[PDB]
């Protein structure tokens, strides 16, 4: 039986602040019991304001990002303006759903700046079904990074703690420290970290080292 | 092509300063049998590209005729625009992917290496659409045996002189001969550089069996 | 009278009258002039204004990051053929993962516009294009015509009264390989203003400039945007 | 190419489909055909043009075709087109009997066909059928019926009418000589031989120059019968 | 792609002028004759043979359609080959579907339909042939004449082609219902012999017969024998 | 007239559309080829219609496949379309049969293609002739010349365009069966400089190509040095 | 089924057994597995006998059109490219295998292997279910540069070996020698098969 | 297939085929309607009395649904086509919406259809003008006129067919709220209208009637003739 | 007779020239663009008092921010209106945002020169639309009024008169318009020009009027509002 889906692992992450949106993912591209490459960053710069993550079946990550960017230049041609994050979110919902019967098996997490300069992160699933959150993990290590991001970012189950706004630095140390917390335990996470920060100034890229073993 | 009839074994790929070199033994199997023992699994696409393939061999010849047909159609124009290795890599990624999308998958695991504009490209494309670059590739069980040797040495030396790469490929293929059941002591080494694609072979692998007298 | 009703009728002189009449369309279009230097491919368009209150119709169309066009003639034909060009470039950056070389693009357009020029009941595209595009071979300025034939030009001027602009461009074509961006656009604006009636003048309104080159993706400059390049003009 | 198109689906400068009216000229030159609607049955009487030569008369009648269990049709004009129309009507009524398990009423059948003739008269550019048709058929809704359709696709129910050569004189004689609701089958036979006697200018009417088939009811079943020659000579002699 | 509109349009008088002209073409065709006996049907048609170079045995106008049906035409030859192949196709469909030799009235209905389809379709002219289909089954003879307009007539005995009017008037005085087959053949051959102009031979007139044993062509020997006694 | 479409013979039996299209080829600029002992050479009187055009605009020497060249004339877009059709032809033949298509079969296929448009009112003839050159160790040099009618003839020396007659009278002056490419190139040059009516329609380019032994059967445009020495000698022969 | 081909200087030699079995009882104990594709191009069938036959006939059709259209005998490489295309385009529907062999002016004798839709010239290209029992013999007894009689007695020996061991192969051994002169069809009756170690 | 462009502009901007189709309507049997308080009446002139004629199958006032009926004039066959398409589409509307069609829906439908055949390959324009009268689910009366050009309108009372100029002049003169206060003043309005154009006061049009939330009601020629003597 | 795709000796399609002449017979409509929004008034040209005045609707809605005036073959513009409606709503579905005016007039502008008589896979359009539209609306770029014609050229205009008396009326538009104009001034001005051009005496019945403001959706002025604005005459 030919199987058309393989879990190439690698986790992404996205956070929304008052004025930014980080997106991060490990670049281990695993399969079975090996490591294809210790470098295949799973964030793809879509526009000047929108950084899209993709984890899961690596082939559909490539095809899906290529289709998205093609749709962005189609939009820009017929409308004379780049898609915002809102439009990219909805359009990626109809792309991911128009194959409802043989899915793109790719957990997207689109983070970026809406037209109000405020953070926005649209976590998806393989068959469409999006939403806007303030933070999100996806992929292999979503279950080990999600609760800690609830804790230090959502401040849930706390008492007598000031729900201070999410500052860019503390979001950074959250990203790196949580990916280390995953690299210790998740088998599919590690070998690098590709943290892309989004602001009005453009997209600045930052990488981090992790456990290789 | 749901089932493989005549497969090959692992292909090896490794970059080096100013060119890429790959090897793939000239064996073509049919089950456990080593039916075809003098088939070449490395193609020259043009002066700057050369391709490899494990897995099903018939589909490899389909990609030879189609792909060489493309580069010949493009050489016909004589407009100075030729597919860099990145273009050929992306194309095979799309053909393989689409064929997957129809559930008629080309059962290849190709490894495209090339050298255009002094930048050694080295791609990978398996049947399901997975693709990526890397300093060292090995399809099939080569990703199990020769792959740790190549990432070990490249870890020790990410930039390699050409001959050091060639010995590294020879020694990896020595391991594949000793341990890969579908292997055979007859392989080609392809070198793509400034000058062009040169396909040496059939080569062979010296083998040591001193351990065979150690058991007692 | 009996030969000028169809595209598929050879005259006794061996000429397709409908195709020639199709080129009369581009000859009536608002003058648009392109040209190129060693590094840049410049376009310059006079956006006609039907009424004083009406705005000058757009003559430049973004085709991709490195290719832009300048129509003149039947506009709807121009947006059809532009949609085709865009679909070509998107398909190339999809499959081959690299920008389409321009000459191949104008070849595709050539074979496209050739088809109705030979099949009964179709009509030749009455849209005469200039295409600017930068690729590995340097900047390009192709001219296409209703006859489906395309040209590779140093500098060409199409539109009504374009012959003056081509006259000037013969007067100064020998300087174009060395000109920087601004001087180049100055040449284009002068030659384009050679076409209009003497009293009427180039302004920020009726001019558009789409430049594309080595270190610059294709960019279109509108009414206030041509201000920087819209000065002096002796 | 456009030089060659006859444009058979366009109006004139006065709103008259030239091909439909020219077709009406063709049927205007066809052999006269008329039937009468009565209480106890219906009869059709058509001037034959197979008159007389070395013909064989292999068939039972010339211009009368059987359409289902319960109907009959008479054509006039283009013989071939009449063939195509008859085959099409048989196909329609038998599709209705497949899809409903009952006979098809006359009105539904005529409408199904006349939509076809109209369809050619509107688009497709084909020439319209130059074939007028008179129908007779019984149905459990409305009783015995007579439907005249013409090339334009228009049709109407009639109690007795005549299409073809001298149709004007025929309908005139019917206006002078039809007793609405009081014409019997035999009264219909006599009147029909009256009209055909006066109209057919070929001169002494024979049994060979016409045929008549009558439809009536018998024991919960419909009977479609053609008149044998002895009955025709009998009825013409009676007409004398 | 081809013209889609009908080329035959009702003239303002309403008579299809293309079928008038096509009938004029058949009227100029080589003369043919058919007569129905009590037990069979004769078909004899004139060979408008040019130079003696012709291999006269190479092609025949009287082709069988099955074991019991014939065809003769009058006018345009190649068109006739079209209708022959079409007829063979139809009779074979009927034989597959119902497992019975096709009754000749049926076959003439269908082939009449096919001759009609081209008086109405797009950009085709009507045929230029008037068929004579003779057939036997149910122990009974059949002889039909199809025209370019598609209508078919059932005949006792008929004539077509060049001088078909004098042919028919020749048959009206010489056909009798009780005519056996051979004397029928004699009457037909005399009928052609009225306006042959050329001294008939066993090479230049064809003779076909359909009886209970089936349809076939009479070899020029036998036809030579019937060309005796005249 | 009687000449309103190809599907209409005149009273004398001449499909006027094909003849007209030939009158379209004859208005274009003359191009010539010469098959010789070891290959084929092409020249192109490519009139440049204005100083604005790039050196290399409107090339009339194509590459329908690596072992076949193509010189065209007349309405040039139609020439390009024949380029696409022929290229599809050789590609189809390499995918079907796995080796370079014999040029003879290629001019059969293309000739049937052009001929496919002289039967219908729905389409018009290609108003363009053209020459095909090829060299191979198996069949040597070959030169076929399709015209608007679709007929394919093999020539030792050909000429198509406006000055076809003068170019023929020039080509008959040669013993082309006994010359090699590197000497043929000069003579084709002299031909183009001679046949070109200079004072009318000045300012053309010379655009040459061969395919044969020296190019290993690979059709390629002439080296610029060889073209320039050729123009130099031919112009010197004008004098 | 055990078909075999060999390349020697003037041409080739296509041996083949003559049994086609249905399961455990044979259907045909004489069947020529060598159907001509042209005057001098034979294809040795195997696998689905019906499928192999359809493949041989279609390939013969295209090779004959291409044959006449060029007016020159079609090169064997052409033939194995058409049988290669038809065996590759339908590979999920045909269990066929066609060692297409022959002669041609431009190259001389050839034996192309086309199992699964691939194309590989080879010295000796044995196939068929019995071919899995003679790899040893052919490898031990093949020496390049074989005279024709060496090729014929050689393939007769090899197919003899396969016939003694294999159940899918039995009967007579057909042999044809394709050269510039023409085809020389020969048959090996069961009383003439060279006897080997029988126990 | 036939794909010639039958309907094409002419050297004034006119669509000659549309003007010609409207010519065919102008020779059609004159029809009239009016929109009253709770009733909607249509009258179709006489058409073809022809004493042998059958009445039932030669009427011009067919039913499109429980609440939508229509007159017309011109090429009666074409109008039979449009009537059929409109019927099938009404029922498809009840399939996809569960709500009976407003008169606006079916009228705008048929206007779309006539517009398409004015503007497609190888198709002549319909020669029918349809005065579709009906009741919206709220019960308001509805009169929509649709001509071959495809443009449709609401109407108080409008006349179509031959001589629609004089009759339309009539409803322009005599349509008043006193005129449609009651049923019989409405119907005597319609027949009082056609009587300028009917062939002697008649049978020689009979008509049709629809009451609020009541299926189409026709008239036999007796009750038509009562009004006949009542107006003559 | 010739085809529909024939170019004249001057270089224009015949059918687009004769069609742009056909628009010259339509009733004059006019709209004007201002920084407050855009208004639209069109003469109904009632033919008889038996007509329903609310029947003739020459200013219809394309979405919550795009009002489409027209003039000419009012039948033809139905396919344009429904085309635009399906367009903007599909745009909303897919991209989750309102559709720009330039995008709409470009999309619907794509159908003009989509006509022929030989390609015709369906029975596609056999002649150019005899409609001159004037898509008005507001987007993130703000108020904009895009003219359109049968030839498919959609052009941005500050204020434009289309129809029968578009010649003179347009002279009134260049005569009266100025960038700093307030929207009620736009309404008054346009009604003044229509009153100049109309044959019949003006009233609140034989015209309509709509506007689309930055916060206001598309809206058609009822009878009373129209009268209140015509009190100024």
From Swiss-Prot, chain A:
Instruction: Please give the residue positions where the record annotates the modification Phosphotyrosine.
Output: 122
Q: Which organism was this protein described from?
A: Homo sapiens
Q: Which residues carry this modification: N6-acetyllysine?
A: 176
Family, similarity comment? Belongs to the peptidase T1B family.
Function of the protein: Non-catalytic component of the 20S core proteasome complex involved in the proteolytic degradation of most intracellular proteins. This complex plays numerous essential roles within the cell by associating with different regulatory particles. Associated with two 19S regulatory particles, forms the 26S proteasome and thus participates in the ATP-dependent degradation of ubiquitinated proteins.
Q: Which InterPro entries match?
A: Ntn_hydrolases_N (IPR029055), Proteasome_bsu_CS (IPR016050), Proteasome_sua/b (IPR001353), Proteasome_suB-type (IPR023333)
What keywords does the record list, in alphabetical order? Acetylation, Cytoplasm, Deafness, Glycoprotein, Host-virus interaction, Intellectual disability, Nucleus, Phosphoprotein, Proteasome
**One Gene Ontology cellular component annotation?**
ficolin-1-rich granule lumen
- Name used for this protein in its record: Proteasome subunit beta type-1
Q: Sugar-bearing residues?
A: 30, 181
According to its UniProt record, where is this protein located? Answer: Cytoplasm; Nucleus
Q: Cite the Gene3D superfamilies for this sequence.
A: Glutamine Phosphoribosylpyrophosphate, subunit 1, domain 1
- The answer to whether the entry has keyword Acetylation is yes
| Reported disease | Neurodevelopmental disorder with microcephaly, hypotonia, and absent language: An autosomal recessive disorder characterized by microcephaly, intellectual disability with absent speech, severe developmental delay, short stature, and hypotonia. Affected individuals also manifest aggressive behavior and have hearing loss.
- One Pfam family of this chain: Proteasome
SUPFAM superfamilies associated with the record: N-terminal nucleophile aminohydrolases (Ntn hydrolases)
- Residues with the modification Phosphoserine, per the entry, are 34, 40, 134
Q: In its keyword annotation, does this UniProt entry include Glycoprotein?
A: yes
From Swiss-Prot, chain D:
Task: Point out residues bearing the modification Phosphoserine.
Answer: 12, 74, 172
Taxonomic lineage of the native organism: Eukaryota, Metazoa, Chordata, Craniata, Vertebrata
NCBIfam families hit by this protein = PRK03996.1 (NF003075)
Q: Which cysteines are joined by disulfide bonds?
A: none
PROSITE patterns attached to this UniProt entry = PROTEASOME_ALPHA_1, PROTEASOME_ALPHA_2
**What's the superkingdom here?**
Eukaryota
Query: Record's Gene3D superfamilies?
Result: Glutamine Phosphoribosylpyrophosphate, subunit 1, domain 1
| Annotated function | Component of the 20S core proteasome complex involved in the proteolytic degradation of most intracellular proteins. This complex plays numerous essential roles within the cell by associating with different regulatory particles. Associated with two 19S regulatory particles, forms the 26S proteasome and thus participates in the ATP-dependent degradation of ubiquitinated proteins.
One annotated GO biological process: proteasome-mediated ubiquitin-dependent protein catabolic process
Modified positions (N6-acetyllysine) are: 126, 175
Q: Could you tell me where this protein is found in the cell?
A: Cytoplasm; Nucleus
Recite the UniProt keywords alphabetically: Acetylation, Cytoplasm, Host-virus interaction, Nucleus, Phosphoprotein, Proteasome
What is the name of this protein?
Answer: Proteasome subunit alpha type-4
Record family assignment: Belongs to the peptidase T1A family.
According to the UniProt record, one GO cellular component term is:
proteasome core complex
Per the record's keyword annotation, is Nucleotide-binding included, yes or no? no
Outline the inducing conditions. Answer: Down-regulated by antioxidants BO-653 and probucol.
From Swiss-Prot, chain E:
Instruction: One GO cellular component term, please give it.
Output: P-body
Q: Indicate where the modification N6-acetyllysine is found in the sequence.
A: 67, 168
Q: Briefly state the modifications made to the protein after translation.
A: Phosphorylated on tyrosine residues; which may be important for nuclear import.
Q: List the disulfide bonds.
A: none
Q: Which domain of life is it from?
A: Eukaryota
Q: Which InterPro entries does this entry report, sorted A to Z?
A: Ntn_hydrolases_N, Proteasome_alpha, Proteasome_alpha-type, Proteasome_asu_N, Proteasome_sua/b
Q: Which residues form the signal peptide?
A: none
Instruction: List where in the cell it is found.
Output: Cytoplasm; Nucleus
Pfam family membership, one? Proteasome
Q: Which residues carry this modification: Phosphotyrosine?
A: 3, 21, 73, 118
Q: Which UniProt keywords apply?
A: Acetylation, Cytoplasm, Nucleus, Phosphoprotein, Proteasome
What is a biological process (GO) this protein takes part in? proteasome-mediated ubiquitin-dependent protein catabolic process
Q: Which residues carry this modification: Phosphoserine?
A: 4, 11, 13
Q: Which SMART domains match?
A: Proteasome_A_N
Give induction info: Down-regulated by antioxidants BO-653 and probucol. Down-regulated in response to enterovirus 71 (EV71) infection (at protein level).
PANTHER family registered for this protein in UniProt = PROTEASOME SUBUNIT ALPHA/BETA
Please give the function described in this protein's UniProt entry.
Answer: Component of the 20S core proteasome complex involved in the proteolytic degradation of most intracellular proteins. This complex plays numerous essential roles within the cell by associating with different regulatory particles. Associated with two 19S regulatory particles, forms the 26S proteasome and thus participates in the ATP-dependent degradation of ubiquitinated proteins.
Would you identify the family this protein belongs to, as annotated? Belongs to the peptidase T1A family.
What is the protein name for this chain? Proteasome subunit alpha type-2
Q: What organism is this sequence from?
A: Homo sapiens
Gene of this entry: PSMA2
From Swiss-Prot, chain G:
Give the Enzyme Commission number.
Answer: 3.4.25.1
**Pfam family example for this protein?**
Proteasome
Reactions it catalyzes:
Cleavage of peptide bonds with very broad specificity
- Under the GO molecular function aspect, what terms does this record hold? endopeptidase activity; threonine-type endopeptidase activity
Can the keyword Hydrolase be found in this entry's annotation?
Answer: yes
Tell me, using the record's free text, what induces this protein: Up-regulated by interferon gamma (at protein level). Up-regulated by IRF1. Up-regulated by tumor necrosis factor-alpha (at protein level). Up-regulated by tetrodotoxin (TTX) in glial cells. Up-regulated in Crohn's bowel disease (CD). Up-regulated by heat shock treatment. Up-regulated by CD40L via the NFKB1 pathway in cancer cells.
**Which stretch is the leader sequence?**
none
Q: Which UniProt keywords apply?
A: Acetylation, Cytoplasm, Disease variant, Host-virus interaction, Hydrolase, Immunity, Nucleus, Protease, Proteasome, Threonine protease, Zymogen
Give Gene Ontology CC terms: cytosol; extracellular exosome; nucleus; proteasome complex; proteasome core complex; proteasome core complex, beta-subunit complex; spermatoproteasome complex
Tell me, in one coarse class, where this protein mainly resides: cytoplasm
Please verify whether the record's keywords include Membrane.
no
List this protein's GO terms for biological process: immune system process; proteasome-mediated ubiquitin-dependent protein catabolic process
Query: How the protein is affected by changing residue 33 to A?
Result: Impairs correct processing at the consensus site
Superkingdom of origin organism: Eukaryota
Where N6-acetyllysine occurs, the residues are: 33, 89
On modification after translation, the UniProt record reads: Autocleaved. The resulting N-terminal Thr residue of the mature subunit is responsible for the nucleophile proteolytic activity.
Active site per the UniProt annotation: 1
Instruction: Report the sequence similarity comment from the record.
Output: Belongs to the peptidase T1B family.
User: Anything else the record notes?
Assistant: Encoded in the MHC class II region.
Record protein name field: Proteasome subunit beta type-9
What organism does this protein naturally occur in? Homo sapiens
Q: Which gene encodes it?
A: PSMB9
């Amino acid at each position: 039986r030919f199987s058309p889906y393989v879990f190439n692992g690698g986790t992404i992450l996205a956070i929304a602040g008052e004025d930014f949106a980080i997106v991060a993912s490990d670049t281990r591209l695993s399969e079975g019991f090996s490591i294809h490459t210790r470098d295949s960053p799973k964030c793809y710069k879509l526009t000047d304001k929108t950084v899209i993550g993709c984890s899961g079946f690596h082939g559909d990550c490539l095809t899906l990002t290529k289709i998205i960017e093609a749709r962005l230049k189609m939009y820009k041609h017929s409308n004379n303006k780049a898609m915002t994050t809102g439009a990219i979110a909805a359009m990626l919902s109809t792309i991911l759903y128009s194959r409802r019967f043989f899915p793109y098996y790719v957990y997207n997490i689109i983070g970026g700046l809406d037209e109000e300069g405020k953070g926005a992160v649209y976590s998806f699933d393989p068959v469409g079904s999006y939403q806007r959150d303030s933070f999100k993990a996806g992929g292999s290590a979503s279950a080990m990074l999600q609760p800690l991001l609830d804790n230090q970012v959502g401040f849930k189950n706390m008492q007598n703690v000031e729900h201070v706004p999410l500052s860019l630095d503390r979001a950074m140390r959250l990203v790196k420290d949580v990916f280390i917390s995953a690299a210790e335990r998740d088998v599919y996470t590690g070998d690098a970290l590709r943290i892309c920060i989004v602001t009005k100034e453009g997209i600045r890229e930052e990488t981090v080292s992790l456990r290789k073993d | 092509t749901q089932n493989p009839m005549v497969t090959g074994t692992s292909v090896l790929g490794v970059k080096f300063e100013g060119g890429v070199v790959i090897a793939a033994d000239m064996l073509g199997s049919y089950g456990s049998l080593a039916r075809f023992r003098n088939i070449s699994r490395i193609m020259r696409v043009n002066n700057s590209t050369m391709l490899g393939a494990s897995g099903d061999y018939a589909d490899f010849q389909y990609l030879k005729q189609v792909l060489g047909q493309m580069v010949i159609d493009e050489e016909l124009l004589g407009d100075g625009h030729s597919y860099s290795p990145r273009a050929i890599h992306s194309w095979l990624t799309r053909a393989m992917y689409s064929r997957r999308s129809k559930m008629n998958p080309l059962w290849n695991t190709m490894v495209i290496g090339g050298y255009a504009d002094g930048e050694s490209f080295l791609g990978y494309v398996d049947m399901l659409g997975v693709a990526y670059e890397a300093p060292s590739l090995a399809t099939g069980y080569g990703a199990y045996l020769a792959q740790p040797l190549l990432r070990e040495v490249l870890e020790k030396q990410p930039v390699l002189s050409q001959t050091e790469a060639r010995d590294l490929v020879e020694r990896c293929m020595r391991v594949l001969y000793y341990r890969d059941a579908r292997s055979y002591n007859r392989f080609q080494i392809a070198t793509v550089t400034e000058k062009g694609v040169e396909i040496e072979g059939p080569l062979s692998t010296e083998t040591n069996w001193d351990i065979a007298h150690m058991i007692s | 009278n009996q030969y000028d009703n169809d595209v598929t009728v050879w005259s006794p002189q061996g000429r397709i009258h409908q195709i020639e009449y199709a080129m009369e369309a581009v000859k009536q279009g608002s003058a648009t002039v392109g040209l190129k230097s060693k590094t840049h491919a410049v376009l310059v368009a006079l956006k006609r204004a039907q009424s004083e209150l009406a705005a000058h119709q757009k003559k430049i169309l973004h085709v991709d990051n490195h290719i832009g066009i300048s129509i003149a003639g039947l506009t709807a034909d121009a947006r059809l053929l532009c949609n085709f060009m865009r679909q070509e470039c998107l398909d190339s950056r999809f499959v081959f993962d690299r920008p389409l070389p321009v000459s191949r693009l104008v070849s595709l357009i050539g074979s496209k516009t050739q088809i109705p020029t030979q099949r009964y009941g179709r009509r030749p595209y009455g849209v005469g294009l200039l295409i600017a595009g930068y690729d590995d071979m340097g900047p390009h300025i192709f001219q296409t015509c209703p006859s489906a034939n395309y040209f590779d030009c140093r500098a060409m001027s199409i539109g009504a009264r374009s012959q003056s602009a081509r006259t000037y461009l013969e007067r100064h074509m020998s300087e174009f390989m060395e000109c920087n961006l601004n001087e180049l656009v100055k040449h284009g604006l002068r030659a384009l203003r050679e076409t209009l009636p003497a009293e009427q003048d180039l302004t920020t309104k009726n001019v558009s400039i789409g430049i594309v080159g080595k270190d610059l993706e294709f960019t279109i400059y509108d009414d206030d945007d041509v201000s920087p390049f819209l000065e002096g003009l002796e | 190419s456009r030089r060659y198109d006859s444009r058979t689906t366009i109006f004139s400068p006065e709103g008259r489909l030239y091909q439909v009216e020219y077709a009406m000229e063709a049927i205007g030159h066809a052999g006269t055909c008329l039937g009468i609607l009565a209480n106890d049955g219906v009869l059709l009487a058509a001037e034959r043009r197979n008159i007389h030569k070395l013909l064989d008369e292999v068939f039972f009648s010339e211009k009368i075709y059987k359409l289902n269990e319960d109907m009959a049709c008479s054509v006039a004009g283009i013989t071939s087109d009449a063939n195509v129309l008859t085959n099409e009507l048989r196909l329609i009524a038998q599709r209705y009997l497949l899809q409903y398990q009952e006979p098809i009423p006359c009105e539904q059948l005529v409408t199904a066909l006349c939509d076809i003739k109209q369809a050619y008269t509107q688009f497709g550019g084909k020439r319209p059928f130059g074939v007028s048709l008179l129908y007779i058929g019984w149905d459990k809704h409305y009783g015995f019926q007579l439907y005249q359709s013409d090339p334009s696709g228009n049709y109407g129910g009639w109690k007795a009418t005549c299409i073809g050569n001298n149709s004007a004189a025929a309908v005139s004689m019917l206006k002078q000589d039809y007793k609405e609701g009081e014409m019997t089958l035999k009264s219909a036979l006599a009147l029909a031989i009256k009209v055909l006697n006066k109209t057919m200018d070929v001169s002494k009417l024979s049994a060979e120059k016409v045929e008549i088939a009558t439809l009536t009811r018998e024991n919960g079943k419909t009977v479609i019968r053609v008149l044998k020659q002895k009955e025709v000579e009998q009825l013409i002699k009676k007409h004398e | 792609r081809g013209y889609s509109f009908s080329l035959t349009t009702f003239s303002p008088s309403g008579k299809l002028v293309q079928i008038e002209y096509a009938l004029a073409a058949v009227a100029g065709g080589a003369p043919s004759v058919g007569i129905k006996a009590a037990n069979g049907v004769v078909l004899a048609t004139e060979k408008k043979q040019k130079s003696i170079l012709y291999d006269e045995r190479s092609v025949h106008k009287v082709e069988p359609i099955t074991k019991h049906i014939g065809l003769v035409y009058s006018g345009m030859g190649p068109d006739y080959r079209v209708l022959v192949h079409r007829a063979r196709k139809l009779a074979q469909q009927y034989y597959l579907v119902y497992q019975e030799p096709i009754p000749t009235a049926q076959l003439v209905q269908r082939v009449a339909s096919v001759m009609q389809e081209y008086t109405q379709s797009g950009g085709v002219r009507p045929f230029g042939v008037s068929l004579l289909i003779c057939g036997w089954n149910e122990g009974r003879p059949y002889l039909f004449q199809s025209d370019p307009s598609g209508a078919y007539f059932a005949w006792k005995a008929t004539a077509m082609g060049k001088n078909y009017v004098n042919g028919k008037t020749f048959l009206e005085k010489r056909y009798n219902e009780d005519l056996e087959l051979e004397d029928a053949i004699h009457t037909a051959i005399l009928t052609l012999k009225e306006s042959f102009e050329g001294q008939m031979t066993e090479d230049n007139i064809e003779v076909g017969i359909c009886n209970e044993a089936g349809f076939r062509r009479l070899t020029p020997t036998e036809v030579k024998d019937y060309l005796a006694a005249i | 007239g009687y000449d309103l479409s190809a599907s209409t013979f005149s009273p004398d039996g001449r499909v006027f559309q094909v003849e007209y299209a030939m009158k379209a080829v004859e208005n274009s600029s003359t191009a010539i080829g010469i098959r010789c002992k070891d290959g084929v050479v092409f020249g192109v009187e490519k009139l440049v219609l204005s100083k604005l055009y790039e050196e290399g605009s409107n090339k009339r020497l194509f590459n329908v496949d690596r072992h076949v060249g193509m010189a065209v004339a007349g309405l040039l877009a139609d020439a390009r379309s024949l380029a696409d059709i022929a290229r599809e032809e050789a590609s189809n033949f390499r995918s079907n049969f796995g080796y370079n298509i014999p040029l003879k079969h290629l001019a059969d296929r293309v000739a049937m293609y052009v001929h496919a448009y002289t039967l219908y009112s729905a389409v018009r003839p290609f108003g363009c002739s053209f020459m095909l050159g090829s060299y191979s160790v198996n069949d040597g040099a070959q030169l076929y010349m399709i015209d608007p009618s679709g007929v394919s003839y093999g020539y030792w020396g050909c000429a198509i365009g406006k000055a076809r007659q003068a170019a023929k009278t020039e080509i008959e002056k040669l013993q082309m069966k006994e010359m090699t490419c590197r000497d043929i190139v000069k003579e084709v040059a002299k031909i183009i400089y001679i046949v070109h009516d200079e004072v009318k329609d000045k300012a053309f380019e010379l655009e040459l190509s061969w395919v044969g032994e020296l190019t290993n059967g690979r059709h390629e445009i002439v080296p610029k040095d060889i073209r320039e020495e050729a123009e130099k000698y031919a112009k010197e022969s004008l004098k | 089924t055990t078909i075999m081909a060999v390349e020697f200087d003037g041409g080739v030699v296509m041996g083949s057994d003559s049994r086609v079995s249905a399961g455990e009882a044979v259907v045909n104990r004489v069947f020529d597995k060598l159907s001509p594709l042209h005057e001098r191009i034979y294809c040795a069938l195997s696998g689905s006998a019906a499928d192999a036959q359809a493949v041989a006939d279609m390939a013969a059709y295209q090779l004959e059109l291409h044959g006449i259209e060029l007016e020159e005998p079609p090169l064997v490489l052409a033939a194995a490219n058409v049988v290669r295309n038809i065996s590759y385009k339908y590979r999920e529907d045909l269990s066929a295998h066609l060692m297409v062999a022959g002669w041609d002016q431009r190259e001389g004798g050839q034996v192309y292997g086309t199992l699964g839709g691939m194309l590989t010239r080879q010295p000796f290209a044995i196939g068929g279910s019995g071919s899995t029992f003679i790899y040893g013999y052919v490898d031990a007894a093949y020496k390049p540069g074989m005279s024709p009689e060496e090729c014929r007695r050689f393939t007769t020996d090899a197919i003899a070996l396969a016939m003694s061991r294999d159940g899918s192969s039995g009967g007579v051994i057909y042999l044809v020698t394709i050269t510039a002169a023409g085809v020389d069809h020969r048959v090996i009756l069961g009383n003439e098969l060279p006897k080997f170690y029988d126990e | 297939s036939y794909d010639r462009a039958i309907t094409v502009f002419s050297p004034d901007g006119h669509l000659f085929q549309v003007e010609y189709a409207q010519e065919a309507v102008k020779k059609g049997s004159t029809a009239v309607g009016v929109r009253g308080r709770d009733i909607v009446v249509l009258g179709v002139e006489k058409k073809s009395v022809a004493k042998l004629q059958d009445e039932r199958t030669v009427r011009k006032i067919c039913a499109l649904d429980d609440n939508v009926c229509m007159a017309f004039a011109g090429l009666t066959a074409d109008a039979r086509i449009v009537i059929n398409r409109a019927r099938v589409e009404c029922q498809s509307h009840r399939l996809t919406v569960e709500d009976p069609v407003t008169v606006e829906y079916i009228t705008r439908y048929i206007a779309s259809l006539k517009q398409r055949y004015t503007q497609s390959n190888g198709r002549r324009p319909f020669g029918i003008s349809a005065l579709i009268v009906g009741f919206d689910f709220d019960g308001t009366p509805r009169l929509y006129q649709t001509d071959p050009s495809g443009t449709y309108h609401a109407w108080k009372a409008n006349a179509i067919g031959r001589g629609a100029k004089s009759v339309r002049e009539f409803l322009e003169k005599n349509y008043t709220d006193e005129a449609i206060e009651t049923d019989d003043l409405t119907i005597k309005l319609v027949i009082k209208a056609l009587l300028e154009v009917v062939q002697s006061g008649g049978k020689n049009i009979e008509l049709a009637v629809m009451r609020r939330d009541q299926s189409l009601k026709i008239l036999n020629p007796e009750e038509i003739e009562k009004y006949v003597a009542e107006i003559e | 007779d010739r085809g529909v795709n024939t170019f004249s000796p001057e270089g224009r399609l015949f059918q687009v020239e004769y069609a742009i002449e056909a628009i010259k017979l339509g009733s004059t409509a006019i709209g004007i663009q201002t920084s407050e929004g855009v208004c639209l008034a069109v003469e109904k040209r009632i033919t008889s008092p038996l007509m329903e005045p609310s029947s003739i609707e020459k200013i219809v809605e394309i979405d919550a921010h795009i009002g489409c005036a027209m003039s000419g073959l009012i039948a033809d513009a139905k396919t344009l209106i429904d085309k635009a409606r399906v367009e903007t709503q599909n745009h909303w579905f897919t991209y989750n945002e309102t559709m720009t005016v330039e995008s709409v007039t470009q999309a619907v502008s794509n159908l003009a020169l989509q006509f022929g008589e030989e390609d015709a896979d369906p029975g596609a359009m056999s002649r150019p639309f005899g409609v001159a539209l004037l898509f008005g609306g507001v987007d993130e770029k703000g108020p904009q009024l895009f003219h359109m014609d049968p030839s498919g050229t959609f052009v941005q205009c500050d204020a434009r008169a289309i129809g029968s008396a578009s010649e003179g009326a347009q002279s009134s538009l260049q005569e009266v318009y100025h960038k700093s104009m307030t929207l009620k001034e736009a309404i008054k001005s346009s009604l003044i020009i229509l009153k100049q051009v109309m044959e019949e005496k003006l009233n609140a019945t034989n015209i309509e009027l709509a506007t689309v403001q930055p916060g206001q959706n598309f809206h058609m002025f009822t009878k009373e509002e129209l009268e209140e604005v015509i009190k100024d005459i």
